[PDB]
Write a protein that binds this DNA or RNA. Structure first.
Ligand SMILES: [Zn+2]
Length: 196
RNA sequence: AGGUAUGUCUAACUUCUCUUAUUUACAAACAAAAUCAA
């Protein structure tokens, strides 16, 4: 569960840490220096991190820094769709555009009970800091998801591309987020999802 | 030769409740079984 990381003792006088918080004191137990909470096992440590308590102390420490100045029934065939990445350009910079194609009424003929069928594909930017394997990380992914088909990701080394500035005139139908409404199109008649 | 006089030149701002559950460690040289004319 430790994912092979080495947490140095508090007295070893600090290699960069994943979270520079959880330590081991003079004794063998694990502690959160901010929260000042002792934890028996790494599982308890992860409960602490996933707990609201630790988070509140993180926000308090950030304030100190500024001062110092449906999920169940989800069908899953895990089928990799076909993406068509292509370097785009407009004006005045460079942006990316993806063309994802979906089934041709091949298997979607057995499921038509208006169960989120009206819901279009959704995209989100995920940090690689969390993976099923947790080995390497440090870059973002433009994940795209649809109920039956399997998720898809696209690595984005560049810190920022096509991140525009008030493209439209501030109209508020949040849909899912500014990203989706701002720059996505869902040709539902042909089943083609464009993203740029 | 000496002395005097005159002139000219040259130098010098401090003292992290409750609740009900789950997770995980730990303590007590804690106790370990059988036999019974016990
Ligand atoms: Zn903490």
């Amino acid at each position: 569960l430790s994912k092979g990381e080495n947490v140095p003792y508090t007295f070893q006088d600090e290699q960069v840490r994943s979270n520079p918080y959880i330590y081991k004191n003079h004794s063998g137990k694990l502690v959160c220096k901010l929260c000042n909470t002792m934890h028996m096992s790494w599982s308890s440590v992860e409960r602490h991190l996933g707990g609201k308590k630790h988070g509140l102390n993180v926000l308090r420490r950030g304030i100190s820094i500024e001062k110092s100045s449906x999920x169940x029934x989800x069908x899953x065939x895990x089928x990799x769709x076909x993406x068509x990445x292509x370097x785009x350009x407009x004006x005045g910079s460079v942006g990316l555009a993806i063309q994802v194609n979906y089934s041709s009424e091949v298997k979607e003929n057995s499921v038509d009970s208006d169960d989120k069928a009206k819901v279009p594909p959704l995209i989100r930017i995920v940090s690689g800091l969390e993976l099923s394997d947790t080995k390497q990380k440090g870059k973002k992914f433009l994940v795209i998801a649809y109920e039956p088909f399997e998720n898809i990701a696209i690595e984005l080394p560049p810190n920022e591309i096509l991140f525009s500035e008030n493209n439209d005139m501030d109209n508020n139908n949040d849909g899912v987020d500014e990203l989706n409404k701002k720059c996505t199109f869902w040709d539902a008649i042909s089943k083609l999802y464009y993203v740029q």
